[PDB]
Structure 1
Amino acid sequence: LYEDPPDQKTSPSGKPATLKICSWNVDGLRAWIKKKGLDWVKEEAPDILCLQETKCSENKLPAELQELPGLSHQYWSAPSDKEGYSGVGLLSRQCPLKVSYGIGDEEHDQEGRVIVAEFDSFVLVTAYVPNAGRGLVRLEYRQRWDEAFRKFLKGLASRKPLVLCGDLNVAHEEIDLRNPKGNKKNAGFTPQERQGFGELLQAVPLADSFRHLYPNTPYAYTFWTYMMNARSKNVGWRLDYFLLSHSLLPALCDSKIRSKALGSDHCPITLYLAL
């Protein structure tokens, strides 16, 4: 059903790529390590690695992470008392100019979901967007999250070009999951969440890097449920994105989906930019 095409490492204007970012919902740092997720990171050797759903505070990080080759500048965020839940990481070869946590809004800054790293020519945000939950019990909260998050990003983008990556917990369009018709009332494919996402692209503004390059390409997913061995049948969802400011599009080389990389129920995604 899907074969990600070869890595295009030069820009439309012929500039070689200078930055490789990789994002990955790891479904628990210790499970991911146990499943050889680190081995794959060493093969990708990104300039910056963003991790979501670490399920782990900084006080309890596995030693294998301290010894991650290349990525020495590491920033970690998690719920401060609740183990086994949410949590994000941002790991970089180069030291950022500034690193901050959350979105400036007390209600939305308790669950370790957002890290912002500022560099010379752009700002990188990684996020683990709140799931709407079984029975949509968190859908109202998610809509409030979506609005606060959008305003925050609009604010960052007014100063510097922006890259947002992570598990944004939404499949934008019907092409972004295998079973759109069965999922219109479920977390990840409700009109409210799909609308929030659409308005995010238009308000900041941001472009969906993968869909911009591959507008008609179906069956490209980043998440498959362990349930019923969905991955072996490619019954999945694209929940993981690189969204970028329109000003960065001339710098865009490729946006990749590493379908075969094991370690989680999500696969990694990888961006090439010529900055």
Structure 2
Amino acid sequence: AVLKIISWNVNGLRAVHRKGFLKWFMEEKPDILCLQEIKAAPEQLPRKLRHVEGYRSFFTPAERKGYSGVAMYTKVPPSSLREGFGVERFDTEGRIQIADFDDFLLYNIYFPNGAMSEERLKYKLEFYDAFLEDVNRERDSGRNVIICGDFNTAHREIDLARPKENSNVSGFLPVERAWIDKFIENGYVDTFRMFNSDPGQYTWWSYRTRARERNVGWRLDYFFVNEEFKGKVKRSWILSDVMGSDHCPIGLEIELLEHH
């Protein structure tokens, strides 16, 4: 038996609602849906977005109005939900959900965009370091972990359409790519690349004339697992045809643990 988990940066939950989000959600039927960039006060969402039949929903908004925010809809209730790393400046931006599903912890993370300033690039890299300390603590205690969301970095040249022109911009800086190398070396696996070694596999396209149509994109959105759990990953894919955001959704199917 498997669970289908989807991750999607929706570029505003109300915005994607107006384009057909609930119809997509009903057709795709994920067991767990992780969203990034909700951008809304949960009590200002229409009640048909706030609560969807068959799911429990959890919203973790930023302090700043209209900014960031993550959400999770799940057909099975988690046993707990942790919304921070325990560091105030990383925990007030609506970026972190860590849901305990007993088989695994599920991290749904909106990692910072560092492109607007050196200040925010430094915040991104420090957030990366706090995340790595957190997941290692949980993994080392004996938990399996699934990490999904918008990492805001394309790992290798194959992961964006125009690597050479982006050497010096956040999203493809050597130091950001090197952090992903370090995360993987700490015993985590980029699940998409377990199954797909092809070029042109992107999850974000700038909201500009025909960029998506021309597939001028970046792979910014990932599903990682700890190494010891990778044999339970059965599929990891990109839902590239699903419109409505500047990112598309990505999927993971994970087999349930089979106790003996």
1:262 equivalenced with 2:246 (yes/no): no
1:230 equivalenced with 2:211 (yes/no): yes
Mapped contact 1:21–1:46 kept (Cα < 8 A): yes
Q: 149, 152, 158: which is aligned to 1:169? A: 152
CA distance in 2, matches of 1:228, 1:147: 36
Mapped contact 1:55–1:85 kept (Cα < 8 A): yes
Q: Which string of whole-angstrom CA distances, capped at 9 and with x for unpartnered residues, describes residues 205-264 of structure 1?
A: 2100001211x3100001111123210100000111100011221111110101111111
Moved more, 238-247 or 132-141: 132-141
CA distance in 2, matches of 1:132, 1:41: 30
Give the TM-score normalised by structure 2.
Answer: 0.94
> Runs (4+) of structure 1 moved beyond 6 Å?
none
Moved more, 55-64 or 85-94: 55-64
In structure 1, runs of 5+ residues without a counterpart are 1-16
Q: Against the structure 1 CA distance between its residues 67 and 152, is the aligned structure 2 distance closer, same or farther, given a 3 Å change threshold?
A: closer
CA drift at 1:133: 2.4
CA distance in 2, matches of 1:135, 1:99: 32
User: Which letter maps to 1:199?
Assistant: K
Q: Which string of whole-angstrom CA distances, capped at 9 and with x for unpartnered residues, describes residues 149-205 of structure 1?
A: 1101101112310000001111001100000111111121111111111111222x2
1:147 equivalenced with 2:129 (yes/no): yes
In structure 2, runs of 5+ residues without a counterpart are none
- Equivalences for 1:240-251 in 2 at 5 Å? 240-251=221-232
1:97 equivalenced with 2:79 (yes/no): yes
Q: Against the structure 1 CA distance between its residues 137 and 183, is the aligned structure 2 distance closer, same or farther, given a 3 Å change threshold?
A: farther
CA distance in 2, matches of 1:193, 1:64: 38
Q: 84, 105, 108: which is aligned to 1:123? A: 105
For the aligned residue pairs, the C-alpha RMSD in angstroms reads 1.3
1:33 equivalenced with 2:33 (yes/no): no
CA drift at 1:78: 1.2
Q: How many residues align?
A: 255
User: Which letter maps to 1:18?
Assistant: V
CA distance in 2, matches of 1:156, 1:33: 35
Identical counterparts, % of pairs = 41
Mapped contact 1:36–1:262 kept (Cα < 8 A): no
Alignment-derived partner of residue 196 in structure 1: 179
CA drift at 1:135: 4.5
Mapped contact 1:135–1:186 kept (Cα < 8 A): no
CA distance in 2, matches of 1:23, 1:143: 22
Q: Which string of whole-angstrom CA distances, capped at 9 and with x for unpartnered residues, describes residues 11-61 of structure 1?
A: xxxxxx411100000000111111112211111101100000111122222
Alignment-derived partner of residue 186 in structure 1: 169
Alignment-derived partner of residue 68 in structure 1: 52
1:52 equivalenced with 2:33 (yes/no): no
Mapped contact 1:42–1:69 kept (Cα < 8 A): no
CA distance in 2, matches of 1:202, 1:44: 33
CA drift at 1:136: 4.0
Mapped contact 1:47–1:92 kept (Cα < 8 A): yes
Mapped contact 1:52–1:88 kept (Cα < 8 A): yes
Q: Which string of whole-angstrom CA distances, capped at 9 and with x for unpartnered residues, describes residues 61-117 of structure 1?
A: 22221342322x11111112x222100001110111111111111221110100010
1:88 equivalenced with 2:80 (yes/no): no
CA distance in 1, matches of 2:201, 2:173: 20
* Greater relative contact order (CA < 8 Å, ≥ 6 in sequence): 1
Give the TM-score normalised by structure 1.
Answer: 0.89
